[PDB]
């Protein structure tokens, strides 16, 4: 429809105001002494939470320009969350600082593109410096330490994470469900995991987790696109009679089929969840055959000849449980016979032996690795259901943090890592004065998280920041105890991956922002 | 949609205004001389009541921020009422005092987190001091005394409560009903009680009680989640033909099933109430088997093999009466044969004998206790139905107060308990000046209930407060007679549990309130 | 009345708006292709002028803050004009450029004091570089050249300035006069020249010149302050009877005496104008004695004993003509006998011989220099009275420019001198980033005059500026002919003194304004 365009520095200040609103809302909760923030609920009592993610997701502004600023900063922060598992608040704070300083500079007659280039140079130098300061977390002891730290200083969950870590190797799959007994139970069952996200958010049966947990679902294997729901009618009737959930893995799903399945989930006569086919091409077909072996199902392909209409319940695979992460899937305890899986593993091993291409060999090796390693299962054990839920959440976030730490490393948390790299990079110079100003903007903006944490603690931000910059190594300021020392010794730790991703995404969105003039919006009605 | 965000001290004063409105509305009715408050009725004459709970539930403001403050304070006060059985007004008054003083302090550049920590330390000290000041109420004479006091000084109801307490022991179940004759009737019939709340408030057939009373309902036992209503169709047809109510206990009930059953209750062709399955895992299954033994029903589980479609009226259990409390459920006079129940008791006793884990042993012991103790039955006795209703309500509240007193104890009521604790804790000091100020704020806020009671009585609040603080022990101010003396002597008593819970929840909501900066709401339209 | 105070960047932008208005108003006329600007007149037609000074003096704004900004910039520009004789427009343009860039940088969150220090360093380097680039104008040929150039390319006036310059030496005194005949005349008559300004602007009998020309005025010499007008009554009566203008040279004049003299001048009975006594102490008294020697007057001092009441017309001195400029005075052809003046010269020469102090020797030497050198008179010669006036104005401005050039030197005019200095100082660095930014601000602001001249010519400013910066030496852009070359060869020349003073005063006012935060004014009524 009709749109109104505002461009120039007026658009910039509008977007800055939107980002300021969102950044204040999020940064209030930063740090161990983070102040609570109350969220509206359409009905009943409002919630109260220190979680930055929820408050961030709840922010929408009235006037459109501020809304776009907040929405796009929020989207980049959510991308950072999905990348690692935390650091939305840090990313938003960094974005706010960089935006404020860079837009001030641009309003000061600064070349925005050179500012972007300088910020990019500064952030890549900071990233490599941070990698230099990373501490390995390969040993099981540090793994238990970080697991304990992430879950509010609980050693049992750290021990469980370390045990499962040992069970399923370095790059194993970890899943957690609610254990019946008071004792924690760890077991290894043959499972699956591939990086594919759900078709629509509406399949999420548990919105507070953002996943689709199904019990004993009948999986359907298809190498074809779901053009028409007529093909889905017989299997839909069969599963409706079976009265059990189901999974759909297919080459593609058309939009109308998606609307039909959304309707069939709102009705929920059938618990249907679909997801893109993993792999690609011949690799996709081979791994779909592997899934068929795991779940005892059968692949339905147009090229081979069989059609989805001629699909029985026996043709479908099955598994004890599946979970559809926002960008990943998990299969647990496939019904398929283990001997068949072992034979498939041997076949793919022979394919590896005869493999000559390097990347094809890598694909085959990771295929057999994820085929044979399986999925670990962690069962929470305590007395009361309330503690089932809270300890399950703690185990989930601790697992995310621990795997992030294992992937890259662990650096002194509390925001002091950014301060350390900033002090290390005090003499970084660009190609000219413009990029130099951009570099300085980035360097002084990387101090925002620690300053905000200290301000939330009620102490003086600048004094603490200067004292930390004076020190070297990992010597930072404990927010909780208000005592200086070494973060590694006192356990305040953050994964290298989360800090790196948050910093990079904040820099990316900030640089993208600094170089925008035109805005288009619908008329305010 | 678009959301208005207000953060800083303006959000604080908005929430303070909302809390002030709600607190005035509730505190007006506090005390024996509490002034009446008139409420709105969409049709007919307005209702006039001194009950703080109703007026509290009917308060919610126009502008959103004050509404949030009122709603969160109301929710916490209602949580206190559910936990104990009274003290909604006391909790609201304490919350108002603490919020006013704490926000007044925060406006002076005071560290909110230290204020919260000081308040928490002060309330913990107050709780332990109150426990020290508690008077045991284990003897039957004090039980009768508190029963008489709670029910507007009626000795007959106190005697009945004492008799039932003797019948079903210290932690027995007690239920109230309507007796045909003028004489009061007492009897013990095997029954159930477990802490589970209703799925939906819409199941409440008697909103003024907040419960679901059913006469001769057909109970259905399920260990599975109610995914589809097709499974519920045959049993629903059977019970529609039977023309009797029913109970539903299941592992879970999905939202679509909840909507379907809400529709089936609005039609009310079938009188249906659903509730979560108590226990957990194997313990859950074992107690579901116990329920089947009590009610003569049968557990329908996927794992065993049978399905809910093959549900006959014989398969369902039955009982003479059930009541679905907000967070509890009660079964009365299960049809099942007593010999089978005794055999199950013996089996669980053998399980206790062979039990090794202390927790499993405790679960088995409480299982046999709840299986064998049964449920007490108290039938109100008088002539007119008006007195049936009022005496039933009196028995209900007296039973609540008496069980609360038995659980923890009884302290001098009328608000002097908090005054005594405050006088005892006059020298409590925090880690610094900030926590000390928070401690003083809490201490002077604990005097609010007595001051409000005296103000309602029309006398000078501060004079009476000082006179009470001068005394020691339980000496206080009888508001009703306007005379001083030991409150225990003249029987102005409150349970220790209700005062402790009210104070603790007021402190918790105050700590949440003070540390709030950002508010997000929907735009006023 | 009350006063409105505005501080912060809002006052800065108010001043910026005022400076912008005044600056573009003045700069429209800059350059040989300067565009006309109309002015005000309460009666009759408005006046159209290309003179920056006339338009500048007329500008004042309606709102007080930007009015203060314009007023102070105008005052500093007028100071620049008085210092040398031109460069008001250049000073205003430089001030505008520096103010815009510096206030932009200050809005960029940059330390204003460091900006001021960097600008001061840059302008000092620019001044010394300009002195290095100066071309001497000692020889009579260059004197004639600059005289011709200043007076719109008229060789006769430059020639006349050359002969007068030779007559009265390098530091001589030149006065312009109206000549009866068409031939130009030159004569040397003993006269004074001391740097004192009029007591009041109201003495100005010819406002378009800003001077006080008196014909055959009597002179009253006094070493005392004029406390009371009673002392002035007898001499006032004597000069009123004489019907001739009066000149008052005295130690000081009190404010009420000034009001009395203003009233008398407005009455027109006496054409009196007063001036401060030059010198200091004994030196002042000695030069007053010298003035008495010239004019045949007598010094009336309290210490000697005589009083101003006992003053006859004989006691007063006399001269053929006097002119009182803004801060300058001229006495022409004192009546007193030349032999007495020569005797006084011999006395002061003996004092020089016996002088031991260096500065006293300098004072005596300059005193004999002004006593013996006298004053040259250049009588303009043409036919019509209109050309009398225009050629007299041309002679005035050419004399000012020529003496300015003789004092310091002559650098390539047309604004390219600043461009050359800026190109020479491209690598000047400050102590830190802020001073460096200020240096760059000044360096890029020195290009404003040439850019504005080119823009007034209608050509492309930046292209011409780049082309000039590419060249070295005095190579620049002729605005009139739109041809490049050497400014010296084509005669486009400006004195070193005027450019230096304009740049220095623009830098001074810019430094003062950049470091301004608060402003206090009267309420707008």
């Amino acid at each position: 429809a009709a749109k109104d365009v505002k461009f120039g520095n007026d658009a910039r200040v509008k977007m800055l105001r939107g980002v300021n609103v969102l950044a204040d809302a999020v940064k209030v909760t930063l740090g161990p002494k983070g102040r609570n923030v109350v969220l509206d609920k359409s009905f009943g009592a409002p919630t109260i939470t220190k979680d930055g993610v929820s408050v961030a997701r709840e922010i929408e502004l009235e006037d459109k320009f501020e809304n776009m600023g907040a929405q796009m900063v929020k989207e980049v922060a959510s991308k950072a969350n999905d990348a690692a598992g935390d650091g939305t608040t840090t990313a938003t704070v960094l974005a706010q600082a960089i935006i404020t300083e860079g837009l001030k500079a641009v309003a000061a007659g600064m070349n925005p593109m050179d500012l972007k280039r300088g910020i990019d140079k500064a952030v890549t130098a900071a990233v490599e410096e941070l990698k230099a300061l990373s501490v390995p977390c390969s040993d099981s002891k540090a793994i238990a330490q970080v697991g304990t730290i992430s879950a509010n200083s609980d050693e049992t969950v750290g021990k469980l994470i370390a045990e499962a870590m040992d069970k399923v190797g370095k790059e194993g799959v970890i899943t957690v469900e609610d254990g019946t007994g008071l004792q924690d139970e760890l077991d290894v069952v043959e499972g699956m995991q591939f990086d594919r996200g759900y078709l629509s958010p509406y399949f999420i049966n548990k919105p507070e987790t953002g996943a689709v947990e199904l019990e004993s679902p009948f999986i359907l294997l298809a190498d074809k696109k779901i053009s028409n729901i007529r093909e889905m009618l017989p299997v839909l009737e069969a599963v409706a009679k079976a009265g059990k959930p189901l999974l759909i893995i297919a080459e593609d799903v058309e939009g109308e089929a998606l609307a039909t399945l959304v309707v069939n989930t709102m009705r929920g006569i059938v618990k249907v969840a679909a997801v893109k086919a993993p792999g690609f091409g011949d690799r996709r077909k081979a791994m779909l055959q592997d899934i068929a072996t795991l779940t005892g199902g059968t692949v339905i392909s147009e090229e081979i000849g069989m059609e989805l209409e001629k699909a029985t319940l026996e043709d479908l695979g099955q598994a004890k449980r599946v979970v559809i992460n926002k960008d990943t899937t998990t299969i647990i305890d496939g019904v398929g016979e283990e001997a068949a899986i072992q034979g498939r593993v041997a076949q793919i091993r022979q394919q590896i032996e005869e493999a000559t291409s390097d990347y094809d060999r890598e694909k085959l090796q990771e295929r057999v690795a994820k085929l044979a390693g399986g999925v670990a299962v962690i069962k929470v054990g305590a007395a009361t259901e309330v503690e089932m839920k809270e300890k399950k959440a703690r185990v989930e976030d601790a697992l995310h943090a621990t795997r992030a730490a294992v992937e890259e490393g662990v650096v002194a948390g509390g925001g002091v890592a950014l301060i350390r790299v900033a002090s290390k990079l005090a003499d970084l110079r660009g190609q000219n004065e413009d990029q130099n100003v951009g570099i300085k903007v980035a360097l002084r903006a990387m101090e925002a998280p620690l300053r905000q944490i200290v301000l939330n603690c009620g102490e003086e931000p600048s004094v603490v920041a200067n004292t930390v910059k004076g020190g070297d190594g990992n010597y930072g300021y404990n927010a909780a105890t208000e005592e200086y020392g070494n973060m590694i010794d006192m356990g305040i730790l953050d994964p290298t991956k989360v800090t790196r991703s948050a910093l990079q995404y904040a820099a990316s969105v900030a640089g993208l922002m600094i170089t925008t003039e035109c805005m288009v919006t619908d008329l305010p009605k």
Side-chain angles (χ1 to χ4, degrees), chain A residues 1-432 434-525:
Chain A
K3 293 142 165 298
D4 72 315
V5 188
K6 270 171 48 64
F7 63 92
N9 64 7
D10 53 356
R12 284 168 191 144
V13 300
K14 283 276 184 185
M15 298 179 78
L16 164 56
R17 187 192 321 283
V19 169
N20 270 324
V21 165
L22 167 61
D24 292 332
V26 170
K27 87 203 295 199
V28 159
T29 63
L30 186 55
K33 296 299 185 57
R35 316 289 176 74
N36 300 72
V37 167
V38 66
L39 281 296
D40 201 351
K41 195 179 301 310
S42 58
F43 64 91
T47 62
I48 305 103
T49 191
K50 308 185 189 189
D51 168 42
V53 184
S54 308
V55 57
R57 98 157 66 88
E58 213 76 22
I59 286 286
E60 290 98 320
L61 270 296
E62 182 65 26
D63 175 38
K64 292 304 201 315
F65 302 141
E66 290 99 339
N67 187 67
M68 301 175 148
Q71 280 301 126
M72 69 205 320
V73 169
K74 171 180 83 166
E75 191 276 335
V76 168
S78 296
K79 197 184 286 294
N81 205 14
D82 298 332
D86 208 25
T88 67
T89 62
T90 314
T92 301
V93 164
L94 289 175
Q96 187 212 6
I98 300 172
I99 290 298
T100 292
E101 289 282 1
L103 272 296
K104 210 188 301 176
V106 167
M110 275 304 326
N111 176 18
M113 291 295 337
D114 268 12
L115 282 173
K116 157 68 169 293
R117 293 263 299 281
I119 282 167
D120 281 11
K121 181 169 184 176
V123 67
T124 183
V127 160
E128 59 85 6
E129 186 69 20
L130 200 53
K131 284 176 175 177
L133 269 294
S134 176
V135 173
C137 202
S138 297
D139 68 338
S140 63
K141 184 65 183 77
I143 288 168
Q145 283 165 199
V146 298
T148 298
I149 289 301
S150 301
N152 209 9
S153 303
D154 185 4
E155 72 283 331
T156 69
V157 56
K159 179 177 178 56
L160 290 167
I161 288 173
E163 286 296 326
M165 186 66 204
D166 308 328
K167 291 294 186 296
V168 292
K170 188 70 72 179
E171 303 304 313
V173 183
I174 309 299
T175 317
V176 57
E177 61 89 24
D178 295 290
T180 56
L182 188 135
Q183 62 277 339
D184 299 287
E185 307 175 1
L186 167 63
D187 60 289
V188 176
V189 298
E190 293 307 307
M192 192 37 49
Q193 187 206 17
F194 50 81
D195 49 19
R196 286 302 194 185
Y198 53 67
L199 267 291
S200 78
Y202 303 170
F203 302 98
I204 301 166
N205 66 344
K206 300 187 178 67
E208 57 91 16
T209 56
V212 191
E213 176 192 347
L214 316 173
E215 290 74 24
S216 296
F218 292 108
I219 311 158
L220 187 153
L221 282 71
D223 198 20
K224 48 181 298 183
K225 324 190 180 179
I226 303 310
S227 315
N228 285 340
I229 208 74
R230 302 185 166 185
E231 303 173 353
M232 296 296 100
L233 285 187
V235 296
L236 274 180
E237 294 146 7
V239 67
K241 299 308 288 174
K244 277 188 185 172
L246 72 89
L247 182 63
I248 289 295
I249 50 176
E251 177 197 11
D252 270 321
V253 184
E254 308 308 324
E256 293 179 354
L258 286 176
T260 312
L261 298 176
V262 162
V263 165
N264 272 18
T265 47
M266 295 298 102
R267 290 171 184 181
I269 301 169
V270 287
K271 291 83 65 177
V272 65
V275 73
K276 300 289 95 175
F280 183 39
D282 301 352
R283 176 208 163 194
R284 146 183 300 126
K285 299 167 190 183
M287 67 162 59
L288 281 188
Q289 164 53 231
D290 304 351
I291 293 168
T293 308
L294 280 152
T295 72
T298 308
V299 179
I300 299 187
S301 295
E302 282 172 354
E303 48 178 4
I304 311 176
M306 73 291 291
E307 295 172 358
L308 290 156
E309 278 98 333
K310 312 172 287 185
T312 68
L313 287 179
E314 198 276 333
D315 294 348
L316 276 78
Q318 212 188 357
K320 284 203 185 178
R321 198 172 150 284
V322 309
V323 167
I324 301 299
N325 187 266
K326 187 269 183 182
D327 202 2
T328 311
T329 71
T330 45
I331 314 300
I332 296 95
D333 209 329
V335 165
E337 176 45 50
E338 305 176 356
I341 294 148
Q342 184 56 51
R344 195 56 169 157
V345 161
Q347 291 146 26
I348 304 160
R349 204 139 297 174
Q350 293 305 112
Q351 285 147 30
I352 290 167
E353 297 319 301
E354 64 92 20
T356 70
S357 164
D358 61 331
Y359 89 101
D360 282 323
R361 208 177 324 154
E362 289 295 321
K363 296 291 101 175
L364 299 153
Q365 285 173 356
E366 61 81 24
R367 197 163 75 191
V368 302
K370 57 97 181 177
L371 195 49
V375 172
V377 172
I378 293 176
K379 309 202 177 177
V380 181
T384 302
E385 193 264 342
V386 185
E387 53 185 339
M388 294 298 102
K389 307 315 290 180
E390 70 90 21
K391 191 170 173 186
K392 193 185 200 306
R394 280 196 302 177
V395 168
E396 289 274 1
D397 52 61
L399 167 63
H400 286 292
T402 294
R403 66 170 50 255
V406 162
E407 278 179 15
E408 198 148 349
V410 56
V411 179
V416 309
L418 279 72
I419 299 279
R420 265 295 180 288
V421 294
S423 79
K424 286 287 194 306
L425 298 185
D427 66 351
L428 192 70
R429 293 290 173 281
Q431 299 162 350
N432 69 329
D434 292 331
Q435 297 191 353
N436 187 35
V437 163
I439 286 175
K440 290 301 178 188
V441 164
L443 270 295
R444 84 179 38 89
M446 293 177 70
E447 311 188 353
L450 179 62
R451 286 177 183 276
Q452 183 50 38
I453 287 167
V454 172
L455 193 142
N456 292 138
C457 288
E459 299 278 340
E460 176 60 48
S462 67
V463 163
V464 174
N466 178 275
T467 301
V468 170
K469 287 194 290 293
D472 285 353
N474 302 128
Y475 166 83
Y477 168 78
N478 193 340
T481 71
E482 309 197 356
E483 316 299 332
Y484 288 90
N486 174 18
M487 301 288 144
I488 296 173
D489 303 348
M490 44 183 96
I492 299 164
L493 298 179
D494 280 16
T496 309
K497 189 190 177 316
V498 57
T499 46
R500 179 190 54 81
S501 63
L503 177 56
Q504 268 162 336
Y505 283 13
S508 161
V509 65
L512 205 63
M513 185 65 73
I514 290 162
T515 67
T516 59
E517 279 90 340
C518 182
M519 301 205 48
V520 293
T521 61
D522 314 323
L523 273 295
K525 184 60 64 178

